[PDB]
């Protein structure tokens, strides 16, 4: 009778960039979801497929917790069937996604005077990302027809660019911490029930 560790994904001292989002495995636990749903501390709490309203009486094979940080105006992009730089090049969700997305403001921690530039996102790519894909390549992007030869000159760009987070920005330019809980059900253990 051991409860799930959610203070390791939610109450985490450091979050990851959107292009290199972090993933955690949670299994063999007594996970309680009423604490999260009834905490009155999260701005966005949306569940697709499953109903959050007192469905803590279900069992799943495995739980994936994917966490990262984005800007506010892009929080609506973390959803099935969304377009934009984040959805196409950084983080993609399947059309038939079942699971929950929790987002909360992180201005008091992730915004710094003069700008906090520790979070990065991909601006260019040859094609869009697949669901749950993760690209960490640093090859320079060629917007022209002449080979770039590994140098960022004319039509040669660094595909990764850093956010600028400041405490005085508007809500669309303020940092937001995002956690996605994805549930997998296989034909054996069903080890994640959480009464």
């Amino acid at each position, epitope marked *: 009778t051991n409860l799930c560790p959610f203070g390791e994904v939610f109450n985490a001292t450091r979050f990851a960039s959107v292009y290199a989002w972090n993933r955690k495995r949670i299994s063999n636990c007594v996970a309680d979801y009423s604490v999260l749903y009834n905490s009155a501390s999260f701005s966005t709490f949306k569940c697709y497929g499953v109903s959050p309203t007192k469905l803590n009486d279900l069992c799943f094979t495995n739980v994936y917790a994917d966490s990262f940080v984005i800007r506010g105006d892009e929080v609506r992009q973390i959803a099935p069937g969304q377009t934009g730089k984040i959805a196409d090049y950084n983080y993609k969700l*399947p059309d038939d996604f079942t699971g929950c997305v929790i987002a909360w403001n992180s201005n008091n921690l992730d915004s710094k005077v003069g700008g906090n530039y520790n979070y990065l996102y991909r601006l260019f790519r040859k094609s869009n990302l*697949k*669901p*749950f*894909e*993760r690209d960490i390549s640093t090859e320079i992007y060629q917007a022209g027809s002449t080979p770039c030869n590994g140098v960022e000159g004319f039509n040669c760009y660094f595909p990764l660019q850093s956010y600028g987070f400041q405490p005085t920005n508007g809500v669309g330019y303020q940092p937001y911490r995002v956690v996605v809980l*994805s549930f997998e059900l*296989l*034909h054996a253990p069903a080890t994640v029930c959480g009464p």
Partner: antibody
Amino acid sequence: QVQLQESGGGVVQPGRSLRLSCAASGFTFSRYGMHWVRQAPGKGLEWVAVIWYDGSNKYYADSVKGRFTISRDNSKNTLYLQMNSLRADDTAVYYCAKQEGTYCSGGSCYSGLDYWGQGTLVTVSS
Amino acid sequence: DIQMTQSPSSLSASVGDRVTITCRASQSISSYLNWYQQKPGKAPKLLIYAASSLQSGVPSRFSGSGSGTDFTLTISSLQPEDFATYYCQQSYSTPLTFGGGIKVDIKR
């Protein structure tokens, strides 16, 4: 009760062709990428080919490039390998493997192999 | 390609001791490493994926760690059923490559 089962192994004369199938049960086939592995008698493990969840991209090893073709039919829950221009160095046990995680499973649609078949023996001789 | 080197190819240990195995790489593969067991005449089956994550059903004594180009695997309690051949695989880019493998035997 997740299960994978291979079929098609046997003897074949050099220069001919062969076809191998693996069928799956216990999970949603269309969400996962699949791999082929082989093990020579007395030798170690060697990776052969990979196909993605939706079948867009296909990749093979250099020792079999231009001869082996991988495909998937996930409306019938099956994965296929076609072997052409067989030499005597292709004698091995073949395993069909399912990777852990859905879709790209956290990176470039490649991840660890958590469910394996029992394998089939293919020997090329005369 | 990325060559995955596994050495030594043999090892001897006695029941109750701690066993450590090392796998080497040739380029940067981040944390895309996996460990497999194999007993004679049997399918491999997975022990640790993502270089630090246990698989469901594995006894809570196998532990794996490592990032970059060098990795390790630990047992910490050798049981009579822990005598097999161990393989390491990378899943960063194609062609995905296996290691040579190491065999653990009984000491007398």
